């Protein structure tokens, strides 16, 4: 077949390659054998290799390396190193006696990277969400669809939306869709918060924003989820030395990172809030974030769906009617519904039964949903 002949035209050149590689390896004069070269590398790299910063690169075979003690040795860089992955500020391995650049480092990631990355799939899924059909559709079109079927967008000739805002009152499924997207997506999920962006010293906020988005690029394809972005605003903290204006400069750094000079890689931004009126309109502009999607309080059908979802695992008593909860005609949220169910279970175990009852649900009403 055509593909079989392609793979054969690959394997034959490969066999040619091993033939040549062997031939040369043996006619080498008992030297330069890959293992022999590696042993010579070990010999010339020294038994200890100090880790020091690379202050600047002057040219190939030369560089200024700052030792941990502060000395600034101008020293050669040997053929061993790739002469790549070397940028000012990088770690470098230095021969103990001559301080020659003989390796590079930073194979490990930072605690900030570890905390931001979500090295797990949240158990919540789109099936565990009831009522947010349009919001799910739009967030999928923004985050998942361009990753799973880029053919649609490439054929249509458009680029997918870069950002999405989930705006809604206190508890409507915004972080829930964030969890579902993290669960189902194949991209690296980086979670941050606005109060978590508000830093203490001057210049830490912008530095953290830059670090977060640099990590997102390094781990691209990535989804950066900034929950409660209005926390960078509404909330005021004394730890913040600069104050309102340092907050403004952090917001400006966010502006630049979302849409600035540097060309972004594959980093889709999700950003959630319940006070979207306090956000800077420049932050929300279409180039930085389009798809501002609302999360209204569930209607009667959606509330019924929430109760079905959150009671699917509870052994509701035959007399229990999951209809009086909905008939309670207040600003009931999905968070309220889940808390009512959870505290009903708590009273069930308190009063020793494994089956939840109407009285348990009513006292849960009166306890958590204080109305």
């Amino acid at each position: 077949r055509l593909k079989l002949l392609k793979l054969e035209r690959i394997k034959d050149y490969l066999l040619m390659e091993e033939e040549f590689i062997r031939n040369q390896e043996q006619m080498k004069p008992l030297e330069e054998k890959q293992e022999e070269e590696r042993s010579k590398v070990d010999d010339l790299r020294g038994t200890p290799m100090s880790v020091g910063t690379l202050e600047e690169i002057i040219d190939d075979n030369h560089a200024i390396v700052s030792t941990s003690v502060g000395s600034e040795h101008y020293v050669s860089i040997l053929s061993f190193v790739d002469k790549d992955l070397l940028e000012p500020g990088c770690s470098v391995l230095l021969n103990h006696k001559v301080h020659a650049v003989i390796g590079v480092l930073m194979d490990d990631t930072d605690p900030l990277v570890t905390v931001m990355k979500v090295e797990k799939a949240p158990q919540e899924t789109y099936a565990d969400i009831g009522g947010l059909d349009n919001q799910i559709q739009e967030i999928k079109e923004s985050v998942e669809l361009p990753l799973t079927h880029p053919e649609y967008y490439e054929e249509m000739g458009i680029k997918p939306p870069k950002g999405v805002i989930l705006y809604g009152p206190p508890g409507t499924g915004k972080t829930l869709l964030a969890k579902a997207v993290a669960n189902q997506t194949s991209a690296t999920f980086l979670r941050v918060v606005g109060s978590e962006l508000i830093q203490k010293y001057l210049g830490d906020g912008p530095k953290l924003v830059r670090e977060l988005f640099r990590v997102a690029e390094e781990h691209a394809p990535s989804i950066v989820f900034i929950d409660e972005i209005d926390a960078i605003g509404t909330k005021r903290y004394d730890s913040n030395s600069g104050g309102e204006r340092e907050i403004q400069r952090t917001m400006l750094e966010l502006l630049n990172q979302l849409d600035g000079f540097d060309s972004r890689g594959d980093v889709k931004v999700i950003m959630a809030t319940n006070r979207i009126e306090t956000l800077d309109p420049a932050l929300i502009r279409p180039g930085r974030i389009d798809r501002k999607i609302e999360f209204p309080l569930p209607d009667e059908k959606t509330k019924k769906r929430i109760f079905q979802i959150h009671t699917s695992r509870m052994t509701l008593a035959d007399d229990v009617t999951l209809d009086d909860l909905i008939m309670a005609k207040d600003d009931l949220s999905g968070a309220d519904i889940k808390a009512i169910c959870t505290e009903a279970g708590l009273m069930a175990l308190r009063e020793r039964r494994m089956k939840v009852t109407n009285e348990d649900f009513k006292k849960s009403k009166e306890n958590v949903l204080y109305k």
Partner: protein, 389 residues
């Protein structure tokens, strides 16, 4: 035989690796192709390491045998002399002397220190945006092009008339009008050192660290022959100085004043041309706005009807639109809109087509996109505030 062929291919790859070099990236090692051991042994046996110091003073600078006071950073200060391979004139009283160990004399003159943060600002990879990707701001493009490119491309037409071209521009306008887009276009089209700076990148935690890196940025630009600097989001540090009573913004005002003195002070600023991108050109200091520092202020006002039609054309060039476009109708239907709004309209038309599972975007899809991006999102618009700003 397909699976046999893949198995053989991977076994062949494994053998090639096992006999050439496989995995050495943990300690940032290189593939063994460019391993010149014969040369590196002579390098380590013939090129001694040099500790970097600074020549503080030249005692007896006259032709008589001089002496140089070096200050090996954080190590010690010494009186030393030059290597016989180094000419006296190659070393001044401020150059990084670069002296060896062991009778610290084997000199190598060494350039000024640059903070890694500052030096990681040169635009190495040029943006993929061109001047043809910007529409509706023809005069702004012409003026910015003049200022930044034309002196750097054909200086003869300027020295013939004896003109000093304007050196400094302020691209100012509402959020999303082509400011950063035009900066990226300039960076792409320019053959010179382009250094991007972000206003938030000049906020540093220790007093005199913002001004320090402003000085380092400008002196690196000076070391380079032809440099364009681009302060984006200049609102961050550039703000009118106010006395207050609690010393607020003293540090940012100090770094701004350092930038002011570097742009126009008691010194020839050099062959540096500066761009200032902003959407709040009402906080900027009057000294910063003085035409000795921002010569060619340019306004990226919201595009008119022709500009909006041109932007729609630009953003729909590569789309799968149908026969009849009526992008002029779309432009009149979405007035006082930004290029960001227009690109979002085009994208939303494409997404409506995709959602309907069509491969052709039609005028109805575009009208739905306009309704979604211009009308429904009208409450999140930044123009009503930033036009006043």
């Amino acid at each position: 035989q397909i699976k046999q062929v893949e198995d053989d291919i991977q076994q062949l790859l494994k053998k090639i690796n096992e006999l050439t070099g496989i995995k050495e990236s943990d300690t940032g090692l290189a593939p063994p192709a460019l391993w010149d051991l014969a040369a590196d042994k002579q390098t380590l046996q013939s090129e001694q390491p040099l500790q970097v110091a600074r020549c503080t003073k030249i005692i007896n600078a006259d032709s008589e045998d001089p002496k140089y006071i070096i200050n090996v950073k954080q190590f010690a200060k010494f009186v030393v002399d030059l290597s016989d391979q180094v000419a006296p004139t190659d070393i001044e009283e401020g150059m990084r002397v670069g002296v060896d160990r062991n009778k610290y004399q084997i000199h190598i003159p060494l350039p000024p220190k640059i903070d890694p943060t500052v030096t990681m600002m040169q635009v190495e990879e040029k943006p993929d945006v061109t001047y043809s990707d910007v529409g509706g701001c023809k005069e702004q493009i012409e003026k910015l092009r003049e200022v930044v490119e034309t002196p750097l491309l054909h200086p003869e037409r300027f020295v013939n008339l004896g003109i000093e071209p304007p050196k400094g521009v302020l691209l100012f306008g509402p959020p999303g009008t082509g400011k950063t887009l035009c900066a990226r276009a300039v960076a792409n089209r320019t053959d010179a050192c382009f250094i991007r700076v972000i206003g938030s990148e000049l906020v540093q935690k220790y007093v005199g660290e913002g001004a320090r890196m402003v000085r380092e940025l400008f002196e690196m630009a000076r070391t380079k022959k032809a440099c364009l600097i681009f302060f984006d989001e200049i609102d961050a540090i550039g703000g009118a100085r106010f006395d207050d009573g609690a010393g607020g913004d003293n540090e940012v005002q100090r770094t701004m004043l350092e930038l002011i003195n570097q742009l126009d002070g008691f010194d020839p600023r050099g062959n540096i041309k500066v761009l200032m991108a902003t959407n709040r050109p009402d906080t900027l200091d009057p000294a910063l706005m003085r035409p000795g520092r921002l010569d060619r202020k340019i306004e990226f006002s919201l595009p008119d009807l022709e500009g909006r039609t041109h932007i729609f054309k630009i953003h729909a060039r590569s789309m799968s639109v149908e026969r009849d476009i009526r992008f002029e109708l779309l432009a009149r239907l979405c007035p006082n809109s930004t290029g960001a709004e227009i690109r979002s309209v085009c994208t939303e038309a494409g997404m409506f087509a995709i959602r309907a599972r069509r491969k052709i975007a039609t005028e109805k899809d575009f009208l739905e996109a306009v309704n979604k991006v211009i009308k429904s999102y009208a409450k999140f618009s930044a123009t009503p505030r930033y036009m006043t700003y």
